[PDB]
Amino acid sequence: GNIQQQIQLKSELASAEAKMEEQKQQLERHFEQSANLLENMAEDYKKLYTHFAQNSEQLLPESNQVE
Amino acid sequence: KGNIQQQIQLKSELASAEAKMEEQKQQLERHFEQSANLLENMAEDYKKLYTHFAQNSEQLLPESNQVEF
Amino acid sequence: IQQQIQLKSELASAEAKMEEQKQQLERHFEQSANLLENMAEDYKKLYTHFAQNSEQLLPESNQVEFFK
Amino acid sequence: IQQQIQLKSELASAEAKMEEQKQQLERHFEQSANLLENMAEDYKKLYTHFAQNSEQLLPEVEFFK
């Protein structure tokens, strides 16, 4: 076809483009849930670390210098 | 512009969209595979930090009671 | 011989220290637990997320072993 | 008399155990402080794999930089 080929393309390019677009919608629903779930663990860690550095006063300042 | 020009371009941006979509597909497959790796890493290091506590609590507090450990 | 008062007090005292360092080791582990158990629960949250988005965003052909 | 000898050894027994308890509690910290610096190692990896896979997969993201 010369114009059936054309009305075909425009319709597989609108369907292609719509898949990309809203699969883009959920890739960013992914990296948004991802990033702050890390910020959960990074804060659950950063206070598990502090609990250890503070119960580090449970020794002489010589017998535990690390970290 | 015209009808043969506007055709050979659709032909290019449909191929460029199909190539883009397959690229995007095998770099999701890359992301969830290199994520499943680093996450199990995270788990097997927890199971280090957890059982280093599971024993040092029942081993430095003998008479004392235990919370789940 | 009556430097026995001193011995019997050094023994009530050093023994008290160990009774208080036993208070602190009970504290340290009981809130090392709930602080640990937090991390644990962030993990299987951040884990299952990468199990849903690993199959709600991806064909059936990448059955990455790690996810159920 | 002879219990100036039972006490003197009871002290040495308390004093050495108060002591071995201190360097077991010491070894319990050396091994913790290096086991969450394994988990800190893991975290940094997982995060930069999200930064370098949210930037390379999308246009504009929030946390990463």
Å from C7 to nearest chain D CA?
Answer: 6
Backbone φ and ψ for B47, nearest 5 degrees, come out as -60, -15
Q: Do D26 and D46 fall into the same domain? A: no
B61's CB contacts (< 8 A; 6+ apart) are C22, C25, C26, C29
Q: How many domains does chain B have?
A: 1
The answer to whether C29 contacts chain B (CB < 8 Å) is yes
Q: Do D40 and D16 fall into the same domain? A: no
C-alpha C45/C-alpha A6 separation (Å) is 48
Identify the domain containing residue B46 by its residue range. 5-58
In a domain, A46, yes or no: yes
In a domain, A47, yes or no: yes
State the virtual CA torsion across B3, B7, B10, B12 in degrees, nearest 10.
-140
The answer to whether B10 contacts chain A (CB < 8 Å) is yes
C55's CB contacts (< 8 A; 6+ apart) are C67
Q: Do D14 and D40 fall into the same domain? A: no
Is residue B5 within 8 A of residue C12, CB to CB? The reply is no
C-alpha to C-alpha distances, B69 to A29, A57, B1, B56, D9, nearest whole angstrom: 37, 24, 74, 10, 36
Å from A55 to nearest chain C CA?
Answer: 7
Resolution of the entry in angstroms: 2.8
| Per-residue buried b or exposed e for B24-58, using 16+ beta carbons within 10 Å of the residue's own CB | ebeebeebbeebbebbebbeebbebbbeebbebbe
Where do the H-state alpha helices sit in chain D? 6-33, 36-54
| B39: chain C residues, CB-CB within 8 Å | 43, 46-47, 50, 66
C-alpha A41/C-alpha B15 separation (Å) is 42
The answer to whether D43 contacts chain B (CB < 8 Å) is yes
Q: Do D21 and D39 fall into the same domain? A: no
Nearest to D15 by CA among B64, C26, C7, C5: C7
In a domain, A1, yes or no: no
In a domain, A27, yes or no: yes
Q: Do D24 and D40 fall into the same domain? A: no
Residue pointed to by tokens 């699969």: A23
C-alpha B41/C-alpha B46 separation (Å) is 9
D15's CB contacts (< 8 A; 6+ apart) are C14
Pick the residue from chain C with its C-alpha nearest to D36: C36
Q: Do D25 and D41 fall into the same domain? A: no
In a domain, B54, yes or no: yes
C-alpha B12/C-alpha B7 separation (Å) is 9
In a domain, B47, yes or no: yes
| DSSP 8-state code for residue B59 | T
Per DSSP, the residues of B6-23 read: HHHHHHHHHHHHHHHHHH
| DSSP 8-state code for residue A64 | -
In a domain, B27, yes or no: yes
The answer to whether D7 contacts chain C (CB < 8 Å) is yes
Q: Do D52 and D26 fall into the same domain? A: no
